[PDB]
Amino acid sequence: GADGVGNSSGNWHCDSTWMGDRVITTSTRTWALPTYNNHLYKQISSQSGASNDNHYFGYSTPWGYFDFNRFHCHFSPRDWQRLINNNWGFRPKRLNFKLFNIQVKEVTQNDGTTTIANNLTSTVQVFTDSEYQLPYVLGSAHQGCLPPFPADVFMVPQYGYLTLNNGSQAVGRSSFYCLEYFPSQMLRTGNNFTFSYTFEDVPFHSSYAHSQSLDRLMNPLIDQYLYYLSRTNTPSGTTTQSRLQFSQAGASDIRDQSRNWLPGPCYRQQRVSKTSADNNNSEYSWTGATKYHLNGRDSLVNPGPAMASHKDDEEKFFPQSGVLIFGKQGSEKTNVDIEKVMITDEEEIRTTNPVATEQYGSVSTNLQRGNRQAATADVNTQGVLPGMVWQDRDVYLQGPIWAKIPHTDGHFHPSPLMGGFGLKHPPPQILIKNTPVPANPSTTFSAAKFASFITQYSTGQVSVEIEWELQKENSKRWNPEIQYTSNYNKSVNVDFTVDTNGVYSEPRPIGTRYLTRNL
Amino acid sequence: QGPIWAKIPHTDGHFHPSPLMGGFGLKHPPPQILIKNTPVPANPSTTFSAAKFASFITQYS
């Protein structure tokens, strides 16, 4: 840091600049940090009797952490539109981080009034691990983001983690991390903190949608030179006999043509409808779910593999867990009606990824003979096969930007299943805490742990700046594209704006896929 | 958990100075660090008196 109590440690920077090829964004927010857990660590675990699936064991810490991982932190609704309408892809490159204008307040709750005053000599300490030595919590899509709207103020969320358990009990291999055991940087009023970071090379995210379905790749005018088996028998006299005929596949045969490629893999979902009348009356929620089984307990696959949500001309149906779901403004935690949630749509991927609610295809179950008749069965789960292409899941406007790839001997197509960018060395976790200030010890000496501290909290401003790389488009498409538009009719409230009471709200999910490409 | 070192007494003779609780005998061990709060007197009387102050601001660090 630098200088005094009266001097300011940083300016407010929130802006976006568009350079053409690369592009740069900036934002600044205001935060407040409480003391958590009365300055002490605690182990936490599952509560008494619980399902074998719900057991957990871990620790909670006094430390907080910053999360900018959602897009809406970085991009405004309009800045989001020189991106998704004008471009075929984007990726991050490098970022900056800064804290400044730190001030610490102590509070006195005596009687029915609470007085608050500056504590000028108190400190707040911050570090960034950057060696990836801690359990990495970010990327699990928790709350506690920097707000989407720059004028809001937010608390910093508390930090904690989980470790191997058996039931509600720990195992010998289970690990315990003390955050005090790292070098950090102690800051007072008039001290600031910075670091900078560089993304590893990662593929552009695909903001295009395809103009060709994988099942139609070819010229309708010209027939193939390959033959397929067409008729298996022919009438002879009164009744048929076995005769094999072959054919070349034309535009009337398009079903039957040879191809060089296959659709992507599927792991199948249950289908439900937004119209309440079509759905069965029972509780199938947990029973009818698709799950995976790991170490004797069952977990839902909430996003699951990337698959189209519905087929043509059914907009009413979506996979049970297969989609992301966002809440509207002020929605509650539990048991809330469908009118409150916002359900995203995965469609444009129909052309490669198969629909999530249907089988991959059909396969032959048996060997035919004279007295046996051919039999097939549906394959509801398919792994990856050579010659198989697919697309990934869209990032939308608000959702995960990145995730940390687990450190393991093998992995396949690491792009993460919620969306965004898989990173082996992602942006490091930033951790922050209030330094404990003891209160009025006894006159005689005693060896005991202090239970008594001054009650205080801190606040300041944080800033983030990321540099993005863009991919422009050369398209010879003659006719116009599909663009993201706001409706021009009159309305009581404007979208993406404060209401009369001053609560900013986001009307609908906005994906990145509009501009079209050929497959 | 236990003694790292001890100070060997200053004497004309000693035998195998390694200390009996454990650890490292040292003739010049790490020196003692000593710390105190400076007394701040409180509100003396107007007329002069020669006496030792019994009254101080109550403070800690």
The string of DSSP letters for A277-321 reads: TTS-SS--TTTT--EEEETTEEEE-SS-S--BS--TT--SEEESS
What are the phi and psi torsion angles at A39 (to 5°)? 60, 30
Resolution, in Å, please?
2.8
For A443, the 3-state DSSP assignment is coil
If you count them, how many residues does chain B have? 61
Query: How many CB atoms sit inside 10 A of residue A360's CB?
Result: 21
Residue whose token pair is 């937010």: A154
Q: How far apart are CA A515 and CA A207, in angstroms?
A: 7
Query: What is the spatial distance between Cα A161 and Cα A42, in angstroms, rounded to a whole number?
Result: 11
Please choose, from the candidates A349, A347, A346, A513, the residue with its C-alpha nearest in 3D space to the C-alpha of residue A418: A346
Per 3-state DSSP, what percentage of chain B is helix, strand, and coil (rounded to 5)?
A: 0, 15, 85
Number of H helices and E strands in chain A, helices first, is: 1, 34
Q: Yes or no: say if A218 and A151 are a contact pair by the CB < 8 Å rule.
A: no
E strands, A395-515, are: 402-404, 421-423, 430-434, 456-471
Beta bridge partners of A271: A319
Please give the full DSSP string across A140-173, using - where no structure is assigned. Answer: S--S-BPPSSTT-EEEPPEEEEEE-EETTEE-TT
Helix (H) or strand (E) segment spanning residue A268: none
Which tokens hold the place of A237? Answer: 């006299």
Going from the C-alpha of A428 to that of each of A94, A132, A196, the distances in angstroms are 13, 7, 10
Which of A378, A405, A209 has its CA nearest to residue A308? Answer: A209
Are the CB atoms for A26 and A395 separated by under 8 Å? no
Q: Two tokens at A134? A: 């801690």
Inter-residue contact A83 to A187 (CB < 8 Å):
no
User: Would you call B18 helix, strand, or coil by DSSP?
Assistant: coil
A189 with A102: CB under 8 angstroms? yes
Q: Are A133 and A122 in contact (CB under 8 A)?
A: no
- Buried-state track B16-41, b at ≥16 Cβ within 10 A, e below 16: eeeeeeeeebeeeeeeeeeeeeeeee
Helix (H) or strand (E) holding A267: strand A266-267
Contact yes or no for A360/A382 (Cβ under 8 A): yes
Three-state DSSP class for residue A71: helix
Which residues on neighbouring strands pair with residue A279, listed in sequence order?
A: none
User: In whole angstroms, what is the distance from residue A4 CA to residue A2 CA?
Assistant: 7
A516 SS3 class? strand
- Residue A14 carries which side chain, given as an amino acid letter? C
Query: Which residues of A34-134 form beta strands (DSSP E)?
Result: 42-45, 57-65, 89-108, 115-118, 124-128
Collapsing DSSP to helix, strand or coil, A351 comes out as helix
Judged on CB neighbours under 10 Å (0-12, 13-18, 19+), A487 is exposed
Give CA–CA dist A141/A145, Å, rounded: 9
Residue with tokens 């006719």: A479
Per the CB < 8 A criterion, the answer to whether A118 and A103 are in contact is yes
Residue A433 CB burial class (10 angstroms; 0-12, 13-18, ≥19): buried
3-state secondary structure of A197: strand
Alpha-carbon distance A191 to B6, whole Å?
Answer: 42
The total of other beta-carbon atoms located within 10 Å of residue B5's CB is 13
The CB density around residue A18, as the number of other CB atoms within 10 Å, is 14
> What are A447-450's contacts with CB under 8 Å, separation 24+?
none
Could you tell me which residues are beta bridge partners of residue A170?
A165
Which residue carries 């001309």 as its tokens? A313
If we measure between CA atoms, which residue out of A86, A68, A57, A88 comes closest to residue A25? A68
CA dist A267 and A417 (Å) reads 13
Q: Yes or no: say if A138 and A426 are a contact pair by the CB < 8 Å rule.
A: yes
What is the distance between the alpha carbons of residues A231 and A224, in angstroms, rounded to a whole number? Answer: 18
- Note whether A13 and A26 are within 8 A (CB): yes
Is residue B33 helix, strand or coil? coil
SS3 labels along A198-261: ECCCCCCEECCEECCCCCCCCCCCCCCCCEEECCCEEEECCEEEECCCEEECCCCCHHHCCCCC
Identify whether the C-beta of residue A259 lies closer than 8 Å to the C-beta of residue A217: yes
Cα B41 to Cα B58: distance, rounded to the nearest angstrom: 9
Give the DSSP letter of residue A74. Answer: H
Report the alpha-carbon distance of residue A370 to residue A373 in Å, rounded. Answer: 8
Contact in structure between A394 and A386 (CB atoms under 8 Å):
no
| Closest C-alpha among A311, A313, A341 to residue A325 | A341
Q: Cβ distance A105 to A474 under 8 Å?
A: no
Closest CA to A464 of A99, A155, A152: A99
Q: Give A206's strand partners.
A: A89
Task: Mark out the alpha helices in A10-149 (DSSP H runs).
Answer: 71-74
Residue A344 near residue A511 (C-beta atoms within 8 A): yes
Q: Helix, strand, or coil here: A73?
A: helix
Q: Which domains does chain A have, with CATH numbers?
A: 3-519 (2.170.30.10)
- Residue A238's alpha-carbon distances to A233, A234, A235, A241, in angstroms, are 13, 11, 7, 10
Any idea what the Cα angle at residue A361 is, between residues A355 and A367, rounded to 5°? 170
Q: Which two tokens stand for residue A483?
A: 């663009």
Per residue in A176-208, is it b (16+ CB within 10 Å) or e — as a string? eeebeeeebeebbbbbbbebebebeebeebbbb
User: Which method was used?
Assistant: cryo-EM
Q: How far apart are CA A141 and CA A395, in angstroms?
A: 13
One-letter amino acid at A396 equals Y
| Secondary structure element (H or E) that encloses residue A496, with its range | none
Q: Residues near B38 by Cβ (< 8 Å), separated by ≥ 6?
A: none
Q: Are A270 and A284 in contact (CB under 8 A)?
A: yes
DSSP state of B6: E
CA A459/CA A155 separation, integer angstroms: 9
Give the separation between CA A115 and CA A375, rounded to whole angstroms: 81
